[PDB]
Design a protein around this nucleic acid. Structure first.
Length: 49
RNA sequence: GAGACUUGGGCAAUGUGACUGCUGAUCAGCAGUCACAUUGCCCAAGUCUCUU
RNA sequence: GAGACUUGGGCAAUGUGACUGCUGAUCAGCAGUCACAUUGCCCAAGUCUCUU
């Protein structure tokens, strides 16, 4: 899986004010994989969790 | 070689636990220096007025 | 000399400004290093099947 970290502007562009200090990441699949769409994460602080 | 099992070897992926340094951001607490401002003590110094 | 006026300078208490350094906390992040797990691939032979 290809994970793309979402910077601050896209965070509150797609999510609420909670995405200010709490990071958001994305999940991206190849077309060969069943999913051809992206998956987004819960706005939350540390990337590890 | 393949199908499967037995053991071993090779590679890879991903995750987990621990350690040593390295910086980042924010916040509190402390010291020192320099400068400006207020008025006064204030003498120097020139000008000017009075006058010495 | 008195006074006006100005430059020269320290001193006086007091005010504010700018800079560096010092200890202390939290969070995040980096580069290393060891230890364990699963998954997948490959190969070897043990066993047999299939095929050259």
């Amino acid at each position: 899986p290809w994970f793309h970290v979402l910077q601050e502007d896209e965070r509150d562009r797609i999510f609420g004010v909670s995405a200010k200090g709490k990071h958001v990441i994305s999940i991206n699949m190849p077309v060969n994989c069943m999913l051809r769409d992206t998956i987004y994460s819960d706005p939350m602080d540390n990337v590890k969790t």
